[PDB]
């Protein structure tokens with residue numbers, strides 16, 4: 001019998017799977033019975049990092065801007081009483097309204113159109129019938145697919161008033177991300193970002209999840225490079241102009257250890273304490289990076305409003 005690590009439980013049944021009208025272009029895994037991607041299988045095992053063409057950069061700018069618009073739709077719905085399923089429904093419609101496919105939907109049979117990660121959920125939480133509670137923290141992770149390209153971002157949000165521990169965890173996590181982004185430029189080793197993130201997390205009494213990493217993204221949802229967020233990692237590769245990847249630190253109040261729910265997706269702290277995450281998709285430029293998933297109409301993430 002599965003022993004839950006914290007207070008959270010899945011709230012079933014799920015509403016029937018939401019359809020995407022056929023005029024929306026679909027990634028290859030959308031119609032695979034196990035949600036496997038033939039294009040991913042063909043590239044599996046590569047450590048070759050794509051140098052994006054100008055056409056690819058235009059494709060990544062567009063899908064990442066639309067992904068930010070969809071996260072912003074989700075951010076507007078965060079309040080006590082709203083279920084994660086209701087947020088996912090709004091996200092699904094917002095994706096379709098922008099002629100995008102919701103990348104998570106049927107990815108290895110993932111059942112929903114975004115990931116909603118409350119409290120002790122590290123990542124990949126499945127939207128369900130649980131209403132958000134005053135005091136919760138919730139990550140919404142949006143991945144969209146447009147014209148052959150995926151874009152990926154996430155923010156952690158407060159549900160009503162939260163305690164000082166929630167404030168410190170979310171603020172430190174956001175700082176970890178911005179300190180890592182600020183280091184991105186040609187010639188920096190991908191393994192260096194984890195030293196920066198862990199140094200800031202540890203300084204604030206938090207741990208860094210080891211089982212999940214930032215990743216290459218463009219024609220595949222994940223590919224080279226692998227970008228760990230913890231110190232002294234063995235990530236292979238050196239940043240060059242035209243590289244596109246995510247940085248998405250998952251930081252925990254307690255220990256770093258994770259386990260998975262019987263659903264096969266929900267990653268939780270083994271100790272049941274809270275975890276927060278922020279994510280941007282980055283394009284390395286000749287001298288810095290472009291934050292493809294940046295908020296355009298505000299300097300700050302939603303939790304600071």
Ligand SMILES: CO[C@@H]1C(=O)CC[C@@](C)(O)[C@@]1(O)[C@@]1(C)O[C@@H]1CC=C(C)C
Pocket residue numbers: 103104107110115123124143211212213214215221222248
């Ligand atoms: C590199 O992996 C990724 C990782 O470590 C960070 C967290 C995820 C969710 O992005 C990841 O786990 C993905 C890409 O494998 C997961 C499949 C994606 C969805 C939306 C279900």
Ligand SMILES: [Co+2]
Pocket residue numbers: 141142143152153154248279
């Ligand atoms: Co993501």
Ligand SMILES: [Co+2]
Pocket residue numbers: 152153214215246248279
């Ligand atoms: Co990601």
Ligand SMILES: [Co+2]
Pocket residue numbers: 040222
């Ligand atoms: Co995969």
Ligand SMILES: [K+]
Pocket residue numbers: 117118119120121122137138139274275276277
């Ligand atoms: K969380």
